[PDB]
Amino acid sequence: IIWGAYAQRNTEDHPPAYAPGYKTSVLRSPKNALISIAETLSEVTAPHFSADKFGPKDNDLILNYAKDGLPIGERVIVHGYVRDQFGRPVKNALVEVWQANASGRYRHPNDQYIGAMDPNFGGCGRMLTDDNGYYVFRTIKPGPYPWRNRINEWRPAHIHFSLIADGWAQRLISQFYFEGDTLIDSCPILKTIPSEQQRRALIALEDKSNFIEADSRCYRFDITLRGRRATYFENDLT
Amino acid sequence: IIWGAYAQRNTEDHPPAYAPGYKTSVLRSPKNALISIAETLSEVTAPHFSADKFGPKDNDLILNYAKDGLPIGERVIVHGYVRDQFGRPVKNALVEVWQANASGRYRHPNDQYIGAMDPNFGGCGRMLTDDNGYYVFRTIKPGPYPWRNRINEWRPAHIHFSLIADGWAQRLISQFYFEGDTLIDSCPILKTIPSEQQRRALIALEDKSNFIEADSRCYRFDITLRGRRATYFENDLT
Amino acid sequence: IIWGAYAQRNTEDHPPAYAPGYKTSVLRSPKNALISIAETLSEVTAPHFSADKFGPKDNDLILNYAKDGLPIGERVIVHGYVRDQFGRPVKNALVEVWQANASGRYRHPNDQYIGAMDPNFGGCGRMLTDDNGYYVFRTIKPGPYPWRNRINEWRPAHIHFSLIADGWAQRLISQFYFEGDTLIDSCPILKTIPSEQQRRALIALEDKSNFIEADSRCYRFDITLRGRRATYFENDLT
Amino acid sequence: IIWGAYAQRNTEDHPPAYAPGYKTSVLRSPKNALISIAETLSEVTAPHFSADKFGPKDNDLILNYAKDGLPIGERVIVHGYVRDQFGRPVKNALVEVWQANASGRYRHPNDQYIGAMDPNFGGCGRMLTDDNGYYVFRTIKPGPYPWRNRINEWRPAHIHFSLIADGWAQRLISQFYFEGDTLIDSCPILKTIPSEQQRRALIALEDKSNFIEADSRCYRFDITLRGRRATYFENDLT
Amino acid sequence: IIWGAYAQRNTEDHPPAYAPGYKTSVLRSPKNALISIAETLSEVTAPHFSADKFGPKDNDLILNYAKDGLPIGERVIVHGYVRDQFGRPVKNALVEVWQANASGRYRHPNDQYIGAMDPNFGGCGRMLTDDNGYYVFRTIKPGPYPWRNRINEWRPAHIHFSLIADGWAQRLISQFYFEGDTLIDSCPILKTIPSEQQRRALIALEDKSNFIEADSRCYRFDITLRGRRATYFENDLT
Amino acid sequence: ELKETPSQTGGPYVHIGLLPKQANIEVFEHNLDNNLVQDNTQGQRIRLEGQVFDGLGLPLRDVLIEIWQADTNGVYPSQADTQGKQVDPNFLGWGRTGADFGTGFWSFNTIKPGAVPGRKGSTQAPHISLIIFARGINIGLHTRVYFDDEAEANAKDPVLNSIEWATRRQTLVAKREERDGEVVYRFDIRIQGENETVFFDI
Amino acid sequence: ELKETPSQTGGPYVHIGLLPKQANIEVFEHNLDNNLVQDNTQGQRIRLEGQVFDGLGLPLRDVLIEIWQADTNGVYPSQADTQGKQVDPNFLGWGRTGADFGTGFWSFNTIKPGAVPGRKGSTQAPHISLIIFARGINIGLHTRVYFDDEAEANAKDPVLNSIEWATRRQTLVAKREERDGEVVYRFDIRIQGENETVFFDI
Amino acid sequence: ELKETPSQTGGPYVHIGLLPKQANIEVFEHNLDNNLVQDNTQGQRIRLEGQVFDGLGLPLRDVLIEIWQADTNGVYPSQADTQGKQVDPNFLGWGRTGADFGTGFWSFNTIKPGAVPGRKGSTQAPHISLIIFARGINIGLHTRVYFDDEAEANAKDPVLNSIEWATRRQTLVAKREERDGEVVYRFDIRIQGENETVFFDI
Amino acid sequence: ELKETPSQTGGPYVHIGLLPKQANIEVFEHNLDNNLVQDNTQGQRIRLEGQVFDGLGLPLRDVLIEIWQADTNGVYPSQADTQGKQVDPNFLGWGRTGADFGTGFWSFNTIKPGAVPGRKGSTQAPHISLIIFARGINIGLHTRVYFDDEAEANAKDPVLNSIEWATRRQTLVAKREERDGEVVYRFDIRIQGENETVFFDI
């Protein structure tokens, strides 16, 4: 198999850059259209990270920052698969996540929300997908977060995630929500996404059969990245 | 107006005593049918509680047990109205509530769940409804609670509430849930209730317009108690 | 009762500032997003107007400008209620209205429409809502008005109205139309409003039972203003 | 991969123990609720059977008991797959089956039905699933069986099956029926199963493409057993 | 695994031999019914072709006949999978295709259509499916072809294909069309096929994600051949 | 017309919200308890104790009990009381307690109620209205406690005579005892099985 | 819960109903105007003038302006004012005017407001709430006017510091000038383009 | 995700397919039985016998029993066993039998199991997992058999202590007896009524 | 076929998960940073610095930057690199940093990349692929950084010549400077307005 370029990103499946409803995008969105280019080695290559550098608790947000005790909150396990648009598994991709705590409070100098800080919770982790594109981490379910878009704006509970995989073109940062959260229907950020089916592609589903008795609940969340086409004739990439 | 007896409790709008799905009810449910009786002064009277005995923070679960700091969790306000089945407001009724903390952990000697305790949260409050039957309290949204009915059973997030009003016949203890929680559809306790409309009568609805910017969210929950009929002819009650 | 701030204005229930279909909004709309702020006494207070200053015919457009005779046109009475979003009546709010005459001609120096002027019609009135938020005035039904958005643009018949009530945040100016007018479906100004339900919130409904025999017809039109929330805990407003 | 416990058995997907319609269950059903327990090595382990002990015709009911000739009846092949609830194949699981003959007569001392015995048919077989969880056996289609629940009760044609696989928790005995049999809709035993979808999970489907010309017909029947979850954090099982 | 015979060809999924609408079939269709036979080694065997004999451009119709330049027409890639009716991939099957050029003109002595010949296009290619039953070739999209069934008959654009695989019983020759072509709904040849679902089984679907920027479009077309059943008891084939 | 809010079990930790002290929570300055006798309360003081047994004969160690009764003169401290008589100013008439986590015993320090008027000009024998709440109990169970030393009054009591299965009436009568100078009435409640306590739908 | 009535532009003839005099209509005996200073009003009198420019830099000649402010002691003549202080009895605190059809200039004769309490025990710098209405404007535009001679107060003002783009804060500060013995603050509003005025959603 | 195949009763003739010999059918050369002790099996040999009674106190004469247990060292002959220890090479650990059509008695010839590890580093008292199948039983009934001569081990057993109704724990303990030089444990199972055997959902 | 997961802004606290140290969180022993030069990395070391400005000309103080580049010989440390050449064994080729909360400045310590092969046997001028993430940015913005001292190479670069608006090509060229003996390339990114930086959809 001789790989070609990644399939074109379908701009209709993503939020536009300019979205008046999400105020901060007004001054931070180019006025010019993006210039599309044919891919080169620069776009189809990406860095490699060895698991050796990762600590044993890097994917355990419940314990990786626990000092004198356990964090206050809902013990939840999140897992799923990462695939490219053609269904192929994404192996050894770097997945990084961050979130607020059970109070909806972030451990960040710029966060001044009255929500209470948890001395035993950090809010960040990372992991590498296995050979099947599978990933799994443990955390405390984040609480909704009030922010100033319109004075009474509230982000539904959410976990920020980032992926660096096989090609630079796949570079992706996004967010996933929890099935059933009512704030999902009124979030200006989530509504920057055009289609309804795409908005639902960011909702983690309750995975009841994978709950761990008297311990933790579990959510299933799959991620889809762009995929490369195979080449059978001229190989122009180079 | 000369009041008569409270309308008959509609047993079809309540869970039966025997519900095999809720295991502990098997040995704690009478095998004999309840004996219905005509009401007397004993059934239509009830105690009176003066607000003078209540502390200023009795209806504030966020602060009434805070020692060295604020509790970890989702700041939420819950309010609503208490009416009798005929729509009349229920004045000065004692409303008592209790719940677990953000971890789904109860401050009770018999609770050994791994969920983390919050040194600044108690989990109980009380209040009296005003002249319009209105009530309002503040708390931290409780987290789901694992329990042993079937080994992997989980109570959806919930707040226990109790009411003592105008007549002994109105004595009622129940629970309310939060709109959108997915555990609602699989709870054996909630499913002891026959009708679907009644199950939904226990769900607190998100009250977005009453959210307090950069502070707290709010849920609306109304409670309906049994009501007395007016008498216009013979007064047999006595 | 201790009042807090007015609920956040739902920008989705109003027209955006920029609406290319309504041409003049192109150069008169900020390019920057509005900056939302937490309310202070400045936003929740508003002036008071005493009815003593109002003349007996201020709410009678049929007679307040009649000189040598009565105005030509359809005698109509318009009334309704003004409430805040929580259903509470708005007492003593200043309601000011203005409109064109039966020809669709405005008594304004800048109006050069061929439509005939009525020497006995002025086109403006005012009134204060009573304790129930009720208002009522009499006028001549305005005729549609041709204007230059697109060369053949026509405003459906309409009456301009303005309200100054209890809080500066409630300041509102808008327009109401008459049930059945076909120009309603093609007006670029009315279509700046996003939802269909909101567009219909500006249509005055025929109130046949309130027609006055051999005299006047009547339209019912209710107005909803923003409402304040009650505070039960910390009072940050000050 | 480090395996944890088997997922909780969903009692709602199985018949209750007490089912008045199935008379014999009245005195043979515990009155106490089952006590759920957390699994230990005892529950997740199970015996192993080597295929060496099985005869060449153990899975051929047409021939394993034929003495002087072939059994009278409809030559049918039954095959399918055994998987755990997560879709994983169940390898080397012991499958044992038994049934009545073409007359609906069982070769059992306690069976006194007038239906004729077949000197060349036994009614029992066994086999082990392969690496894909696949199984296959040959038999004579059983005839319906009259029994005394209500005096005129009739079991639809059916084949009893039993499975012993990887964990004691998977131990399962049940029955499968044949697509199209009208007695299926009125069987008190089949109706002890709550849901309609579960009742259909016991119906073997005609597999026409796998019929063997001028020889045998074929039915497809898949079986689903409970499955174990994988563990990624604490391993409490031991 | 011991293979048996190929499943019976379902005559209802194919066009009959006699189809009055397709005129030439009137004198070239047997009047006698086909005589079905049980399969022998003759029917389940088939020849093997080594890829060594194939040239590098045998599956490239754009270049395998180009002399002084490139062919005029729509550059299209066609690919897909070949499976047997049971979903198993068909490995190393000989796939041969032929078609007219962009004008709808065939390079055949008997074709006298006014459509222009392309000195750089041949119209034929071949290839062997890989281990996954996958195939892929490049060509120029053929133009519709006028022919004499009824004087004004037109074949929609189409590509003729032939397969020789594992068993003589699988021998198949057919045609595939392009999604969206309006001539599909009125072709007498395509309508010889009884069911609507089968007619659609011959339509190649636009595979937009596999288009090659500024180069070629792509169509996806899967082919299903008859499949063999596995034998678990008597092996009569021999 | 609206439907009554559906009932739900009080749960295993009903103590947190209804009896904080017992759960070791000190949030309230004034805590409701099982002592209905105040300094100036009128009437003879009595102790009401007992246990609640499940279908196995085992005591519930997580049950919550509440009682409602009239003063020594049969007048309820409730605006709903229409007797026209004045009620003891120092009597709440209500109390709450919980079984002991270890033994399952519960008790109240109250006053023996006076006879209360029944329907249609009848007279009810002295009684205390009692309700049970606990894990496993979907709806609070109502019952009444009568006293065995009021044999003549109980014989004419309307509610007791409304029970057609006479053998069950005895399950509602507590037994008087004396711990020296203290009057104690023992009332054991049996939810299931033999001698099951009569429960009312009031 | 009900939805707020949707806004609509005031239109080109907004003067008819809100400023009849300017449109040459004399129906009302008492007409609301742009003069907030009465005979006995307290505080230093100031003139607030300026223009409103569109995206082309051209002044709107059909715009209507309104202001809302507190008295000289920072107390609003509104029942909604909870300061417990007494307000100037001779001050409406509100006014209305319209740009000149020819030049586009607008003005108000008012008083310089006193500092008003902010949220959470903070103090707001003196300011006047102003709203713009006009053809092309679908929803009244809210903004505030601060004074450049109150540099120290403005530096600590909560609303001004809530604007994270510091360079824009200056668009809300009027410039003080003197026409002899009269204090005039110039406040030009720019709806679009460079130096666009900050608009609030209150 | 798929749902588990729904259970069904084994029926009155469960013997045909699971115990052909007992039903007088000789199709298999090797037949599974109730003898778990082989020539070289380690540990003390014991006999496990008893009866199964219905709600009337009558023995089921058509019941089928199966047991699953670890070897003498508490190691299961299963690849699922993660103890890292070697299991008795001559022990299947499983067996099957059926009540006698006449008396209703059943029995197994096995070995007394060694203590098996519990969850969270705990130790389980010796026990045998047993399952019941029969006409009238919709789902196989799970239970455990402990031994009365292991009093100290049983007192610390996790599963037995997970049963909050202590009086029922005794229903899971078999009684040791001696038929000369043979150790016999008697375990009667009561499906309904008094002394009903505890059944688990594993 | 599946659709790509939809993008979302990184948010104001993107540092927590991607640059813990900067947010004062020490959970990881090994932290990804903005230093791509190791002890034995080959090639001339350069510093890449600059700022990111919004539509007002104000620097983003919460932006996160990442770069991807080839080694000194134009070979990417990626299995996807098909050049057949060996890559510098001591070069990750990737790095991450964040603007300073106060000044908005960002920087990377890296190596000047070697020329990489373009499509159809062409040669790309040396460049670094850079991506921007931040609050307000719904989808990571892609761009490239070329060097002004590679004038001849840039003139023949395929991507730069694919931009038909020649005046914009200059926005992708960084300016070389010298802080003594250190080579620094200044690359300011302008998201909006004049001299807006060219952004690619790769």
Ligand SMILES: O=[N+]([O-])c1ccc(O)c(O)c1
């Ligand atoms: O067993 N119950 O009834 C329970 C267990 C846990 C709960 O949180 C509850 O409200 C009820």
Ligand SMILES: O=[N+]([O-])c1ccc(O)c(O)c1
């Ligand atoms: O241009 N506008 O906005 C207009 C023009 C005419 C009108 O009658 C009006 O209400 C608004």
Ligand SMILES: O=[N+]([O-])c1ccc(O)c(O)c1
């Ligand atoms: O009584 N039962 O349970 C029965 C009776 C006959 C059957 O063939 C059977 O499978 C079950």
Ligand SMILES: O=[N+]([O-])c1ccc(O)c(O)c1
């Ligand atoms: O302004 N944003 O873009 C935000 C604000 C808060 C958030 O929790 C977030 O994920 C994004």
Ligand SMILES: [Fe+3]
């Ligand atoms: Fe609870």
Ligand SMILES: [Fe+3]
């Ligand atoms: Fe108008």
Ligand SMILES: [Fe+3]
């Ligand atoms: Fe059967």
Ligand SMILES: [Fe+3]
């Ligand atoms: Fe966030």
